[PDB]
From a paper:
Ribosomes are the molecular machines that all cells depend on for protein synthesis. However, ribosomal subunits are exported to the cytoplasm in a functionally inactive and immature state, requiring the further addition of ribosomal proteins and the removal of transacting factors that block ligand binding sites. In the cytoplasm, the pre-60S particle follows a hierarchical pathway of assembly events coordinated with the release of biogenesis factors. Using cryo-EM of 60S precursors trapped from yeast, we captured six intermediates in late nuclear and cytoplasmic 60S assembly at ~3.5–3.8 Å resolution, which provide unprecedented mechanistic insights into 60S maturation.
Author numbering:
A (entry chain V): 312 to 402
B (entry chain g): 2 to 160
C (entry chain G): 7 to 288
D (entry chain M): 6 to 173
The structure:
RNA sequence: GGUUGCGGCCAUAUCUACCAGAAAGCACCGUUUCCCGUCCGAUCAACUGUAGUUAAGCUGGUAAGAGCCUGACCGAGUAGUGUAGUGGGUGACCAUACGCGAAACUCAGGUGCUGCAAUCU
RNA sequence: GAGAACAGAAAUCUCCAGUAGAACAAAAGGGUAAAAGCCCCCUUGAUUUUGAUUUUCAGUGUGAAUACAAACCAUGAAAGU
RNA sequence: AAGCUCGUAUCAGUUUUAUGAGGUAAAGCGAAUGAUUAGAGGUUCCGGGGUCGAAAUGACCUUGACCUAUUCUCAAACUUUAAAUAUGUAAGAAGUCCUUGUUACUUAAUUGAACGUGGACAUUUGAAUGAAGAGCUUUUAGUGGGCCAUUUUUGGUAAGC
């Protein structure tokens, strides 16, 4: 839980699939630390479908800079690993 | 778990002093160390670079190497059944001269002075030192001096 | 209203520090010698500016005390023709020329290493003569002066470099250094050396505000020295320094002991213990 | 004695304690700019209290200092607002005096409804010549006790000029 | 003997309260064109030694002051401690023999000393 | 501690006192005041080549560390680091 | 155990003269630092650890954030001063002094540094006592379960623990 990174959501694009949590809203999200002076925007499907709106602070795992050392993570297909996993909405 | 770090058990030995904190005075740097001089080691707490280990606090060595900021000192340390000859590189704040050697160098000049002076007279060089002798017989004076009588005191509490 | 415990535990700082004169973090880096030299003293050009006076010295280090090798002051310049303005930028250049030609005379490196003489205000430092003795190397000591470009301090440095002393320095704190391009203006630097920045201001204040031209610059009007002749003052002055930087002292009066016979009268003396005990008794 | 032991009005420190940052802070800055004639500097918060609504490093307040002859003229215009009348307070034990007003449209230039209404704090320091020795770099020292300013000396000075009252 | 520049040793030099200082040196002080730096020529920059001052800084003195530093048939040869005994004591611990031996306190005295270069009734 | 509109226990501003009672990524112990803390300006020496030396020690390893030499640079007006 | 080079060599579980280092016993709390046993309130002056939420003006539970008033204690993990016993080095010939040789280091400089030529200082040659010789080397056996006593102590009620 100590690896969570603050994210700021730009908008929510839902695909209309919903099991019990409004499945697969393609959230366009940007980093809290890079929103100020950068132009860098990430693009990710997530289960946080209905509870998320524009300008909300969410927490997330950030795979793009993390060098894990698991043999299970090493035995994957890297180009199928997402850059962002949205974990929970803050406040 | 045990603790055997590089500065363990040095709480009171690397403290600076009482009312002597702050920067060092400039006659520490201006002194001159030539190869072969007898030096003493006392680790300064404020200057962390080039610092002697906690063993060599208080030992005494000989300077063999002189470099920019530091001096090279040899120390005889015992281990097991044998002396070894270990070498250090101490910055000049931690080092200081030994006055026992400095009194030796001026006693040689006095010993050379007495031999050359006694040769002009011709006898009795008399140059070795002698320890404390038992004293000679002498006569004390009771003139204006009566021997005062003492006695043991009784017991009182006054507590 | 200070407790007895407060004065009990009190690191009293060093004597030159609570008086506020000497930085000791700077002094350690200036004094120390590479220990493989064993004796070689590190000579420090000490340039200190008071108001209305300029002090320049060449000193070394010893545990008993610092040893002065040679020194000159701003008030020796009326011997060399400079009367008024003996604390400006230009007189600071003349004093650094005076210590250099003096310390090369008493040392022996006088005939060689003449330095520049046709001075144009261009950054260069002295070069070692082929198959000869090396020039005398003196480092700069500034004390507590804030280092800003165009200062009076580096003018005393420029007189030292032109006199022949080896002083390591850059060209960026001289006046006329440009911020955008990293070059020096040699024409504008040559103005400051001969008092151009003062003689320019004698022009603008003349026609516009006559009221202050009597109050300021009054020594100029008394000797009738106009603005354009100010550049001719220092030009004759630098050649006067090359002739005889011999430092003859003065007579001061009859002797020294007449000075001590005066100053005893005005200082108070300590009372004795029994005279103190008589005052406690009353 | 008299001859150089004289009071003076060393600096005047205008202050506007804006509650929360924003464009309302920058509209307060243009008030001090047209008043003092200089560019004001802005101060940041030290801590986050959250009962006032502030956060750390927010550029919460502005202030500008005025020295020289221009400080006396702004001081005269401020005292006319309160009719040369101050309380038994407003004079510190060090000898300095200050007072705060509100609704700056009552003095000065104009109303100008785009910029709004603001209240200022005026604070005046007092010293004598020779106070350089505490501010300078080389040979720093402290001023002796008989040359220091007191509360009693300022009120004796402030009654003499401007014909004012400490009535409380 | 007094100042100033540069120190050495770093409170016998500091701290608090009042007083005195000729000469010169310092210091306050006057101005903002230029190099330069600030919200503010206050600090630093430059400019004049000019309009003026010992009011401050600085130096010297005084205080049965606070602090600090030396001593002493001061406390005390006491506290502790190294060796020895088929010594005492149910013990706890304590005496002796050959030895080393403090600290707080008490009183008495002290309140910077000096190196280099220059300049001063 | 004493002062300033709204403003109080706590906003911002000012002075006096202030031997570190603060701060220095973290455990505790050292250390530090014109700094080793706070705020600015410039930079990559957190680099290349291999030896000597300290600590645990069998005077082997491993980790960490000190002082140099030969190169190349950073910074500063400079000593230097 | 086999020996080898040498035989007054300078070494020594010691003292003295000189000079270092240390923070335990004792002292101190009217010199800094200082616990303990308990613990009542103040609802966005915080939430820290949760939990449920189609969300946040969002709920519920809890340690509380807060000690908001004073009150004693002394000290292995508190300190200005500081023992005793134990501990490091020096007491010369591989030394001191004149004198001038060496160099690519160093100095403004034949200044320093380092190593030397030639000359001078010997039986008291630089404190005491002792020295069944001093010094170096090769090679291999056994052992790697310990225990007791005075003193200093840690855990423990205490123990032939």
């Amino acid at each position: 839980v100590t690896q969570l990174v603050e994210f700021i959501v730009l908008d929510v694009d839902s695909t209309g699939i919903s099991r019990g949590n409004r499945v697969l809203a393609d959230i366009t999200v940007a980093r809290t630390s890079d929103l100020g002076v950068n132009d860098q925007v990430y693009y990710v499907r997530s289960h946080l479908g209905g509870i998320c709106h524009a300008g909300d602070s969410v927490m997330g795992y950030f795979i793009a800079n993390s060098n894990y050392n698991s043999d299970l993570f090493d035995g994957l297909n890297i180009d199928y690993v997402p850059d962002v996993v949205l974990v929970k909405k803050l406040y | 778990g045990k603790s055997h770090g590089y500065r363990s058990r040095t709480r009171y030995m690397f403290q600076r002093d009482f009312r002597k904190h702050g920067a060092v005075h400039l006659s520490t740097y201006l002194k001159v160390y030539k190869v072969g001089d007898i030096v003493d080691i006392k680790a300064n707490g404020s200057i962390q670079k080039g610092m002697p280990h906690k063993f060599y606090q208080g030992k005494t060595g000989v300077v063999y190497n002189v470099t920019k900021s530091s001096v090279g000192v040899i120390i005889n340390k015992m281990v097991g059944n044998r002396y070894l000859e270990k070498r250090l590189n101490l910055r000049v704040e931690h080092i200081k001269h030994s006055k026992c050697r400095q009194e030796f160098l001026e006693r040689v000049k006095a010993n050379a002075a007495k031999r050359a002076e006694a040769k002009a007279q011709g006898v009795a060089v008399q140059l070795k030192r002698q320890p404390a002798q038992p004293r000679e017989s002498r006569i004390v004076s009771t003139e204006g001096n009566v021997p005062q009588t003492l006695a043991p005191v009784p017991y009182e509490t006054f507590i | 209203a200070k407790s007895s415990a407060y004065s009990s535990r009190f690191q009293t700082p060093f004597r030159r520090r609570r008086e506020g004169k000497t930085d000791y973090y700077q002094r350690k880096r200036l004094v120390t010698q590479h220990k493989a030299k064993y004796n070689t003293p590190k000579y420090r050009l000490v340039v200190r500016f008071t108001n209305k006076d300029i002090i320049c010295q060449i000193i070394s280090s010893t545990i008993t005390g610092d040893v002065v090798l040679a020194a000159a002051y701003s008030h020796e310049l009326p011997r060399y023709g400079i009367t008024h303005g003996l604390t400006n930028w230009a007189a600071a250049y003349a004093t650094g020329l005076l210590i250099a030609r003096r310390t090369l005379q008493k040392l022996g490196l006088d005939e060689t290493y003449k330095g520049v003489e046709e001075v144009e205000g261009e950054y260069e430092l002295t070069e070692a003569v082929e198959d000869g003795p090396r020039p005398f190397k003196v480092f700069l000591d500034i004390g507590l002066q804030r280092t800003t470009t165009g200062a009076r301090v580096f003018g005393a440095l420029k007189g030292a470099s032109d006199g022949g002393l080896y002083v390591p320095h850059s060209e960026n704190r001289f006046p006329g250094w440009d911020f955008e391009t990293e070059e020096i203006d040699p024409e504008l630097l040559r103005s400051y050396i001969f008092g151009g920045h003062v003689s320019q201001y004698m022009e603008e204040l003349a026609d516009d505000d006559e009221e202050r031209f009597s109050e300021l610059f009054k020594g100029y009007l008394a000797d009738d020295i106009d603005a354009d002749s100010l550049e001719d003052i220092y030009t004759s002055a630098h050649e006067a320094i090359r002739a005889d930087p011999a430092f003859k002292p003065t007579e001061k009066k009859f002797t020294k002991e007449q000075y001590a016979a005066e100053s005893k009268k005005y200082r108070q003396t300590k009372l004795s213990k029994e005279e103190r005990a008589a005052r406690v008794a009353a | 004695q008299n001859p150089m032991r004289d009071l003076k009005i060393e600096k005047l420190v205008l202050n506007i304690s804006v509650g929360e940052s924003g464009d309302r802070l920058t509209r307060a800055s243009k008030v001090l700019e047209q008043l003092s004639g200089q560019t004001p500097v802005q101060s940041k918060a030290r801590y986050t209290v959250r009962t006032f609504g502030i956060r750390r490093n927010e550029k919460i307040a502005v202030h500008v200092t005025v020295r020289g002859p221009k400080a006396e003229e702004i001081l005269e215009r401020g005292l006319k607002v309160k009719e040369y009348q101050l309380r038994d307070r407003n004079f510190s034990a060090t000898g300095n005096f200050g007072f705060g007003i509100d609704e700056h449209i009552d003095l000065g230039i104009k109303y100008d409804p785009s910029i709004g209404i603001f209240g200022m704090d005026f604070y005046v320091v007092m010293n004598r010549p020779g106070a350089r020795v505490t501010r300078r770099k080389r040979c720093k020292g402290t001023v002796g006790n008989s040359h220091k300013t007191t509360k009693e000396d300022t009120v004796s000075w402030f009654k003499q000029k401007y014909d004012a009252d400490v009535l409380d």
